[PDB]
Amino acid sequence: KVDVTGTSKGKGFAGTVKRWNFRTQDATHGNSLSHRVPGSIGQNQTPGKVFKGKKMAGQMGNERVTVQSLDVVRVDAERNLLLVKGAVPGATGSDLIVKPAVKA
Amino acid sequence: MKVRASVKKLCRNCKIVKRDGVIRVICSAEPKHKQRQG
Amino acid sequence: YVKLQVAAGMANPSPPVGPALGQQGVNIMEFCKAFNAKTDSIEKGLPIPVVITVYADRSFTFVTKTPPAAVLLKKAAGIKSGSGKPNKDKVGKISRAQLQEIAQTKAADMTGADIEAMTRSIEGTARSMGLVVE
Amino acid sequence: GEQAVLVHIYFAQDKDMEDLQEFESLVSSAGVEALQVITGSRKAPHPKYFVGEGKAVEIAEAVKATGASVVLFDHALSPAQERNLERLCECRVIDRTGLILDIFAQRARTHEGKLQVELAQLRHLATRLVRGWTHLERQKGGIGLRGPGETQLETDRRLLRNRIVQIQSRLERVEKQREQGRQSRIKADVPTVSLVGYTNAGKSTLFNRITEARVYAADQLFATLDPTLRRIDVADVGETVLADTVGFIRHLPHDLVAAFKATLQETRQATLLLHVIDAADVRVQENIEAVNTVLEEIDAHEIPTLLVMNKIDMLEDFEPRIDRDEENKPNRVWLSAQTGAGIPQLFQALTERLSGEVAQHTLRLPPQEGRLRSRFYQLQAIEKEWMEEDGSVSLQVRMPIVDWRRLCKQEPALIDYLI
Amino acid sequence: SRVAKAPVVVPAGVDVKINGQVITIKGKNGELTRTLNDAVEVKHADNTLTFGPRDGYADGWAQAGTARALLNSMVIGVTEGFTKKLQLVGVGYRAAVKGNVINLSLGFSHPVDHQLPAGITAECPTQTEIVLKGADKQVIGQVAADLRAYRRPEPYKGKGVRYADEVVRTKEAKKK
Amino acid sequence: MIQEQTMLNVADNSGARRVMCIKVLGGSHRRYAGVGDIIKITIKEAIPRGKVKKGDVLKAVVVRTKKGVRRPDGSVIRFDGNACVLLNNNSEQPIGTRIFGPVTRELRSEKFMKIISLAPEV
RNA sequence: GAUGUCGGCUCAUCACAUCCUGGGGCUGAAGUAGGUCCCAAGGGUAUGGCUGUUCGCCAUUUAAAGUGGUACGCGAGCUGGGUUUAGAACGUCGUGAGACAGUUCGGUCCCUAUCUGCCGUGGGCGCUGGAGAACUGAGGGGGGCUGCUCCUAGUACGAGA
RNA sequence: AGCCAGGAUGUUGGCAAGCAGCCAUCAUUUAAAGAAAGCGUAAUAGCUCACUGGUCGAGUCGGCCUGCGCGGAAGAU
């Protein structure tokens, strides 16, 4: 088993529905301009602030991601190849760092 | 055991012992008589 | 080990007697032959419980015991029951002659320095049943 | 415990009639002093007052003349009818169900009884939320304006429902407690018999006589609240649990019956019901009907039952006996409480009632049977005891099959007489 | 207090060294060491030991008594070993010694194995018995307690590991 | 891929013609029942004088779906309709005797052997 | 010289008097299954019918469907079913105008974000001659749920079940 | 406080044996024993407490009045 680290595909500025799996509000039944909006973002004046680390819209992807415990299917010395089960982070032609599995 | 603010000897085999800043009753006959203050 | 009262003279009555002491493992056909011959001289109907020191291989041997005292009181009283609480209702007070006749049952196997001290012992049950002396 | 005018109506057309003597008994048990007892006759209830306008004016005049404090109807009447009677006569009005709830409130001494009675009162009062007289008046407003957001009637309904749910939750806690107390016996092969019936049936004193344990009994209606369980001896199965129970009355309130779900768990799960009946009561058939009706209401009519006619001493020149069905199973028994007649026959019928064994074994061994004494006398008993020749001892025994099996497993079972 | 006053008659053939607070005792069975509390003065004045408090310590007497008991156990252990008995009550419960390792069968789906400490030895005269021998009373007690921890005696049938001296209270099961 | 409110045909002779899934059994918030998954159903159409009747609530097993099953080599078997086989609530054995139409090897488990035995194909 | 009300949606956050999962004492704990108390807040913690509903009843689930705080969290985030306008009608009251903590049908929800906060992303300078890389890691965030089946084993326990 | 020894006679008191409950609740030989403290026994047997002495050589027992401490003591950025 190996762990593969790479830079995931970059999605750019991502809304809360895509970035955090927020549930969209009603598409009909009176909804005014509030279909994919994040909804409420806090309480009323007792905290009086937005808390740090809150799930909102922003940059998604294009970040270091590791995938752990992927099976090694084939190790080919002559052609300098390693076949690993499953998808690994990043686009085709991007740098990957492959380590032995730490958990195994 | 039973945790109650009032701990007493429930029979003649009970013994009061203070262990970790906590008063306890240990009984060598009836395990129901195990008590701690709390 | 269990013990129960035994009828001395009766053989094969259904309610009271069977596991009295023969079920402990004593050969009753010999025990209630020798002891029945002994109690033939004893008055009619005195259940007398002896101490048991026996084996479990068809062999036995019994020690002597004096007959009871509580059973004998109710002869002259004319009543064969008991009161719920003595000292309030009585079954008829009996005489000192009868009390000493009952006492003489326990006189042959007592090691006391003075035999008169047994008077209090015998009259304890007299007071605990309602046979107050005059 | 105040002055009252009593009201009764002869609704002979339908089965919604009630007994005036029983009503007076309930009133006196409550402790109320009756200054007058008014009677009427109608076909169906008047919607406005529950009585005619003329009869309502008569009860108002009676209250005015006698200076009475309350008016006790012998009937269920609606909140609007109560309101209209209150408007005619300033004195307060108590329904039959209100009187019963008040009696139970006075009688309740235990935590469980208090909980059940307050639940019943809370439901009965939640029915009577019709007048919202308050000093805050109607809260005017509009769109986007401050305010409570809801009506006071709805708010009060919310509050009553919430507190009713709270009483209920503590009641299922009490049910869990009583269920643990029950489950102590069910893991054992316990026989459990619950004696139940109409009030003043003598069933509490029957319990007292059978169990030799003191429990309250008198000529007071609804004397007993909550059950009492006691160990009793029966020839066949040995140890059994006799349970006393709170009595019934014609037309128990449904809210009260629902409240007593925790208390009635003994009758729900009883292995036998002893339906104790006052033979001297001229309304004996009505008592049977009412008791069966409440049993159906609590859904406990499928349990085995056995009727027990008490108070035969009030019947002239009668001796106790047992009436038996076509299947030769005792379905009815007669007896008396004080004289003790019929008690041994009740015990014999109880022996016959529950059992699954009639075979009797005969045992004998060499001198290795003190353990047999202990085990037999441990499970049940020695049925027929005697000795025979050569020191052998011939027992005859009859104990349940479960006792047979456990004895066989425990012992070497070399006696080859007991299975 | 009184135990502290009572002195420890140190027998022959055992070597005592009072290295300040550190106290070492050698004997036929082995060497045992202790580091007494700071509020104890341990002294030689004969073929014996003497215990007392150091001035300026409230505990003083308390410590003194504890040191006396510990050193008495030390000398007893080095002279003659401390022994402990354990017994296995069970349908198929068993013990075996493979050399500083005690294999136990106690109804578990796996076999238990207890590796003994350094100075403790084990024997099994019978499959249902374990004999512990050692120098330190505390260590042999702790090892016996660990052996009991796997299956301490349950009340209904007395099933498991019990000290041979213990009275195990047995309660009847639910009625009928 | 079977949800609540979805209509299923019946692939057995228990009597029901169409049933509706009202709970997907398994875990909490579970979404879909695939082939070989137990569902809770209500009968919406039934032949008269059958074992079951209209309005009955009982259990069923999905034996065919339009979404299909995936095989380990990556193939898909899709069907023209969704069909199930009725089961008893407390025993999970099929109510009927005959099974109509094909099934898959996803029912190759110790509990659905009786369905596989009387299925006409696979 | 205005601090928008009930319920719903979106998004949540803490407390622990714990609903589930973990650890344990007692048990009227034989076993399975429970009860009660103590420790424990890491994670998890229903879908529908009816009703404006919160609740509640019911159906079917789940390991569980916790209890409370947060302007009874959350309308410069949505809605507008309910309450609390103007139209109209029924019952009731009043001579009437009208009224009702009765019911019924209908009935406008604005704001382009300066500051705090928060999610992302840059410019400047600094880090002591400049520049290119590769790091250590002080510190911070994420994540931490659980069911069912089989073996041990029809064994331990149990009269059996 | 530690360390050895005895708890028996009527009698299984009576209405189940001291030990379900109820009434007598008194003797006894005697250094001593409550018609019996719970356990336990179907219940006896058994268990042993109260009950009394031996050996053990400096303090020990438990009520009162008070100083200061301990537990009783769980909330929401």
Ligand SMILES: Nc1nc2c(ncn2[C@@H]2O[C@H](COP(=O)(O)OP(=O)(O)NP(=O)(O)O)[C@@H](O)[C@H]2O)c(=O)[nH]1
């Ligand atoms: N003449 C006579 N009176 C009896 C008889 N049995 C009971 N009684 C009397 O009737 C009343 C019975 O009351 P009780 O024992 O409480 O019976 P209950 O039905 O359990 N009371 P409740 O159900 O109301 O709690 C008492 O007055 C008792 O004296 C009987 O056989 N004959």
Ligand SMILES: [Mg+2]
């Ligand atoms: Mg839109």
Ligand SMILES: [Mg+2]
């Ligand atoms: Mg009663």
Ligand SMILES: [Zn+2]
């Ligand atoms: Zn105790």
